[PDB]
Design a binder for these strands. Structure first.
Ligand code: CL
Ligand code: CL
Ligand code: CL
Ligand code: MG
Ligand code: MG
Ligand code: MG
Ligand code: MG
Ligand code: MG
Ligand code: MG
Ligand code: MG
Lengths: 203, 148, 189, 99
RNA sequence: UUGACAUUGUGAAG
RNA sequence: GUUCUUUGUAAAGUGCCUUCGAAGAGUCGAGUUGUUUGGGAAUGCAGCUCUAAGUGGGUGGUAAAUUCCAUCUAAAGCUAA
RNA sequence: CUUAGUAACGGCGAGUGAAGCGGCAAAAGCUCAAAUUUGAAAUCUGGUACCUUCGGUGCCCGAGUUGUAAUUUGGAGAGGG
């Protein structure tokens, strides 16, 4: 079908056709609220491969997030400590802007579950994202065998605990020697390696 | 047990064995290996030469399994044969009936020649061997077979 | 804090280690609960042996490659050579691994023999529901043990061709060292 | 591909009887198909060329392929990706005006 | 505070 | 263990021949800054800039050019002990 | 459990410091996107009447072709014979 063409055309972001479309759309988004409902996905092909379905119970929201670093919120720049901790301006937030977008949408619609999100646009000040949401109370979802797993109480506020795709990337949840510190949770690994184990018959 | 310690003997002696002049303070001289080059230099230069500095070249991601090679000397070679069979082979030193010893199956990597073996032909299978070890095996009528 | 002739110590206790001390007081308690769990599981699951059939594989690394052990599961080719499908094998008590490959004929033949022996020593009750009563054997690994393959006979004849084993190792080591330079020297001419 | 049978050398290791496993379909992941080649060619004629791709075409014609590879390395990442991009631009040049 | 890049498009001349 | 329904010109598995075999983009990757790691010409994470490919791509613990080999299949998801 | 206070990091000072293999406990596997059902949107929320009521049937609006079912997830698999 047409989904194959959409995937390949989306990759030519600096072509003349897409540069025109991204300029007119970035203006339209900026005129709306920071968070607002979207009637339909602007990238239907991208939504499908992230788990979106065109049925009642699936919701799309659009959100813009300020770009740049994270200035340390200290009064007048004083840190009251050793010079190794006196940095103020060149500090970076450990979670991505995509993660921040999902969190604020999640609080706005607390009756829904965050599934995934994707990049749509950006400018000098903002990055724009569209978040995919699933209603766990709708009977179309609770009776759907492929999606009723999200109705379980263990999946409440996935984006808050970093259980989404962007959350697992920032947690370093991968396999291999490159992720020894964060294979199964950084803090749990630190607890295991800093625990003194004593048996009844001392070894 | 606490009843056999010198603490029980020091009861009623004021200083508890630490002296009146010097006393028992918290950390006179520092903590741990502090002052190893300034006020503990003499105790480091003797009893521990070579502590300060670096010598060789680094090796990133060292795996100790690559260097596994236990050594076996010829004076211990016949211990690999079970004791109930050593006597018959020793007294039946001959060709076409030479016992076969799998050194790798016993968990050794290289054969070294230190002692003296009986003048009996033996078939020795190993991954590595020293030059002297092979000569003594052949001098007794045996052979060395390389395996992997 | 350095005095006398004593070894250098490296005790790592400069953190809040007393907050993370784990004493295994319940070692005896956990053993009882594990035995209770195995007893309850066996009575509940089926008269089946409570564990799946495992293949025989060669241990990796030059340090351990002299021994065989129990692997994850039988390969798709090994399962196919035994005369059944992978989907049916999983429901009959045979572990199946899809990512292990077959490169050695001796390991492949040994694993196929295990599957053939296993099929001849089990009774598959029909789905009809009759299920004639049978005694439960608690272990399938003990029923089919893994044995180290034999390597050589106890005694043979001495066969010396005059070449030194030490000399052979030295030549093989030297020839590998200078292979690259000799190819370059021959390439330039 | 036969090992020597001794613990050291080029083809060191024990000799065992060899088997060839069936090829795994996952080893052909990056293989072009008839459908995918049709789509990519059609999208190329629709979308046109990127601004940096136009600069590489100018450099090839006026300054030579060697310098275009140097510029392509800076825009792209590795040096091996520069070769593929410069080679791709040559095919575009050979058909745009040369034929 | 100063420079570079991004935001950043359209027309002409020296 | 018994008992009421036949689900169904339904569903599933297996042999041989031929043609095919769609597999995730501001993402991978690169530069730079900060932080972090035992990871040391840079372990992971994040900001900004640049920005891919399809016999391709990642990895192979010393930076680079050239020729091979080995091993997996990222950028979507669920799951008891 | 061990590897191991080891490889490595560190005014290479004070100090810091994993991982592969090996034995064991427990063991379980999997599914979406990307394909024309096209001789038939075959899919679903809700309303309403009734019934054998953690639901079912009939009827009626609505959702949905800017894609809801069946079929296939790389171990493969699919269209024909
Ligand atoms: Cl998905
Ligand atoms: Cl006394
Ligand atoms: Cl560095
Ligand atoms: Mg006194
Ligand atoms: Mg006193
Ligand atoms: Mg004193
Ligand atoms: Mg004094
Ligand atoms: Mg921090
Ligand atoms: Mg999960
Ligand atoms: Mg630390």
């Amino acid at each position: 079908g047409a989904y194959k063409y959409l995937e390949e055309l989306q990759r030519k972001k600096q072509s003349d056709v897409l540069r025109f479309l991204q300029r007119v759309r970035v203006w339209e988004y900026r005129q709306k609220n920071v968070i607002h409902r979207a009637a339909r996905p602007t990238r239907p092909d991208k939504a499908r491969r992230l788990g979106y379905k065109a049925k009642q119970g699936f919701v799309i929201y659009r959100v813009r997030v300020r770009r740049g670093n994270r200035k340390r919120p200290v009064p007048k720049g004083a840190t009251y400590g050793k010079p190794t901790n006196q940095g103020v301006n060149e500090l970076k937030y450990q979670r991505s802007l995509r993660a921040t977008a999902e969190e604020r949408v999640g609080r706005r619609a607390a009756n829904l579950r965050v599934l995934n999100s994707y990049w749509v646009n950006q400018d000098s000040t903002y990055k724009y994202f569209e978040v995919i949401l699933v209603d766990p109370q709708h009977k179309a979802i609770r009776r759907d065998a492929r999606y009723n797993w999200i109705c379980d109480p263990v999946h409440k506020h996935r984006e808050a605990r970093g259980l989404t795709a962007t959350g697992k990337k920032s947690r370093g949840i991968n396999k291999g020697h490159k992720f020894n510190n964060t294979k199964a949770g950084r803090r749990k690994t630190w607890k295991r390696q800093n625990t003194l184990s004593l048996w009844r018959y001392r070894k | 047990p606490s009843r056999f310690t010198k603490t029980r003997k020091h009861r009623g002696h004021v200083s508890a064995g630490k002296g009146r002049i010097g006393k028992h303070r918290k950390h006179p001289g520092g903590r741990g290996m502090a002052g190893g080059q300034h006020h503990h230099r003499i105790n480091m230069d003797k009893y521990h030469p070579g502590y300060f500095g670096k010598v060789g070249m680094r090796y990133f991601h060292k795996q100790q399994a690559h260097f596994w090679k236990p050594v076996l000397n010829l004076d211990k070679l016949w211990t690999l044969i079970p004791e109930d069979k050593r006597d018959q082979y020793l007294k039946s030193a001959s060709k076409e009936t030479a016992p076969v010893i799998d050194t790798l199956a016993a968990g050794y990597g290289k054969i070294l020649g230190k002692g003296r073996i009986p003048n009996v032909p033996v078939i020795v299978k190993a991954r590595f061997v020293s030059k002297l070890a092979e000569e003594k095996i052949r001098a007794a009528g045996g052979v060395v077979e390389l395996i992997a | 804090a350095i005095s006398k002739n004593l070894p250098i110590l490296k005790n790592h206790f400069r953190k809040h280690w007393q907050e993370r001390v784990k004493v295994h007081f319940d070692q005896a308690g956990k053993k009882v609960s594990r035995r209770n769990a195995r007893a309850t599981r066996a009575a509940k699951i089926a008269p089946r042996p409570l564990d799946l059939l495992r293949p025989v594989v060669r241990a990796p690394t030059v340090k351990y490659n002299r021994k065989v052990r129990a692997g994850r599961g039988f390969t798709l080719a090994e399962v196919k050579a035994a005369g059944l499908t992978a989907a049916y094998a999983r429901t009959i008590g045979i572990a199946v691994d899809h990512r292990r490959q077959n490169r050695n004929q001796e390991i492949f033949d040994a694993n196929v023999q295990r599957l053939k022996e296993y099929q001849s020593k089990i009774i598959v009750f029909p789905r009809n529901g009759k299920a004639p009563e049978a005694e439960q054997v608690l272990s399938a690994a003990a029923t089919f043990p893994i044995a180290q393959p034999a390597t050589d006979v106890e005694a043979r004849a001495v066969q010396d061709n005059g070449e030194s084993a030490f000399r052979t190792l030295r030549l093989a080591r030297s020839e590998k060292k200078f292979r690259g330079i000799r190819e370059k020297r021959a390439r330039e001419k | 591909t036969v090992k020597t049978g001794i613990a050291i050398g080029l083809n060191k290791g024990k000799k065992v009887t060899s088997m060839t496993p069936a090829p795994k379909i996952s080893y052909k992941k990056g293989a072009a198909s008839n459908r995918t080649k049709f789509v990519r060619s059609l999208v190329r004629e629709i979308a046109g060329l990127s601004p940096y791709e136009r600069r590489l075409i100018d450099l090839i014609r006026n300054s030579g392929e060697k310098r275009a590879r140097k510029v392509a390395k800076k825009r792209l990442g590795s040096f091996t990706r520069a070769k593929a991009k410069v080679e791709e631009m040559n095919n575009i040049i050979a058909a745009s005006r040369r034929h």
